[PDB]
Amino acid sequence: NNVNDLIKVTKQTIKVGDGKDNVAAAHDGKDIEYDTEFTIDNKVKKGDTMTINYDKNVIPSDLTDKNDPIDITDPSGEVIAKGTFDKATKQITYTFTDYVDKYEDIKSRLTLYSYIDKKTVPNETSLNLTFATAGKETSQNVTVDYQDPMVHGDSNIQSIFTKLDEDKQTIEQQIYVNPLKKSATNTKVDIAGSQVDDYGNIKLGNGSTIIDQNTEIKVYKVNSDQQLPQSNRIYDFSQYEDVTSQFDNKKSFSNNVATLDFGDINSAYIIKVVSKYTPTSDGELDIAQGTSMRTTDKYGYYNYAGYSNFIVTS
């Protein structure tokens, strides 16, 4: 059964990484990388188990709970152990394969990726993270830096992905419109099923989603005296005013773009979007969706601010 006592940890580290460096599931924003190197006593045998613990304030993916843990593999890719993840205990239990009966003096390394829990850590702060391999812990202080909005003139916006449902092939995006609570004249918000640059220009060929009349779009108004979580992720929409039906006659669609006519505003809004995506021909994700806010300055010229999210698996 459990052979944690026969696992010696050579080195284990925790850091903040960039999501684009998680090759198996690359994404915008940051993540936590746990890199562990350990030796397996020769006494360990097939079907024996070891554990790895995540920090209580991280989640292996904050987009879905359906993935299995990655295997422990050698440099050639032979499988040393297969894992199962228990959400309750935030622990992986790894079961050694026959690899540990056929090889001796085994060393192994693993990198596990995770996300700060945005419900537990809704705003920027520093905190201590603690992980463990085979019951041996290490700790690391990290600073959590969430993104800034993109700001041009009165145009100011930010977005993140929040929920992937691979059964229905949908992605959820949460967009903050005017989080700075500016007075924004003739505001238009686009949602495009492609990457968008910082000025709202569509950049086709960098991932996609489908944005059309069947995309679910909900819109919430934020009061002057409400501050939005810096994490960009809302867990409880009941605290905001659902104004979705006010947009029934304010939406238009053209060539995989939705436009919402906000008009003259002086408040922040939250848009929650659920859109369909299309897996690639070889069974991977190549998801990208962007948003932009257009406002009119006092001289009648337009300012645009864009934001874009992505998930690309391999």
CA distances from 202 to 51, 83, 260 (A): 45, 41, 17
- The ranges assigned to domains in the chain are 1-146+313-314, 147-312
Name 151's bridge partners.
156
Q: How many angstroms separate the CA atoms of 270 and 264, rounded? A: 16
Q: What angle do CA 253, 257, 259 make, to 5 degrees?
A: 60
The token pair at 80 is 């040393």
In angstroms, the Cα distances linking 89 to 1, 25, 55, 84, 92 are 18, 23, 10, 12, 9
Cα torsion through 54, 60, 64, 67, rounded to 10? -100
Contact, 41 vs 27, CB < 8 A? no
Q: Does domain 147-312 have CATH number 3.30.420.40?
A: no
Could you give the CA distance from residue 269 to residue 247 in angstroms, rounded to a whole number?
Answer: 12
Residue 237 backbone phi and psi in degrees, to 5: -75, -15
SS (H, E, C) the chain: CECHHHEEEEEEEEEEEEHHHCCCEEECCEEEEEEEEEEECCCCCCCCEEEEECCCCEECCCCCCCCCCCCEECCCCCEEEEEEEECCCCEEEEEECCHHHHCCCEEEEEEEEEEECCCCCCCCEEEEEEEEECCEEEEEEEEECCCCCEEECCEEEEEEEEEEECCCCEEEEEEEECCCCCCEEEEEEEEECCEECCCCCEECCCCECECCCCCEEEEEECCCCCCCCCCCCCCCHHHCEECHHHHCCCEEEECCEEEEEEEEECCCEEEEEEEECCCCCCCCCEEEEEEEEEEECCCCCEEEEEEEEEEEEC
Which residue from 172, 113, 154, 133 is spatially nearest to 9, judged by alpha carbons? Answer: 133
What are the CA-CA distances from residue 181 to residues 43, 61, 157, 267 (Å)?
A: 63, 31, 11, 5
* Rg for the chain, CA atoms, rounded: 23
**Which positions ≥6 away from 220 have C-beta within 8 Å?**
234, 237, 240, 241, 242, 243, 244, 269, 270, 271, 272
Distance set, CA 265 to CA 180, 221, 314 (Å): 12, 10, 42
The tokens describing 250, both together, are 């304010």
* 8 A C-beta contact, residue 146 and residue 256: no
Task: Report residue 167 as tokens.
Answer: 């059964």
List, in order, residues 6 or more apart from 24 with CB less than 8 Å away: 70, 113, 313, 314
Question: What is the DSSP pairing of strand 49-53 with strand 30-40?
Answer: unpaired
Could you tell me the end-to-end alpha-carbon distance of the chain, in angstroms, rounded to an integer?
33
The amino acid that residue 177 corresponds to is V
For CA atoms 276, 281, 283, 285, give the dihedral sign. negative
Where b means 16+ CB within 10 Å and e means fewer, 31-59 reads: bbbbebbbebeeebeeebbbbbbbbebbb
Contact 247, 219 (CB under 8 A): yes
Query: Is there a common fold for 1-146+313-314 and 147-312?
Result: yes
Q: Residue 9: exposed, middle, or buried by beta-carbon count in 10 A (0-12, 13-18, 19+)? A: middle
Tell me yes or no: is domain 1-146+313-314 CATH 3.40.309.10: no
> Phi and psi for 217 in degrees, rounded to 5?
-125, 115
Residues with Cβ within 8 Å of 258's Cβ and at least 6 positions away in sequence, in order, are 190, 191, 192, 211, 212, 215, 217, 251, 252
Structure-determination approach: X-ray
The pair of three-digit structure tokens given for residue 255, joined into one six-digit string: 């060539």
Amino acid sitting at position 241? E
Q: Which residues pair with 161 in a beta bridge?
A: 173
- Per the CB < 8 A criterion, the answer to whether 62 and 26 are in contact is no
CA dihedral 116, 119, 122, 128 (to 10 degrees): -40
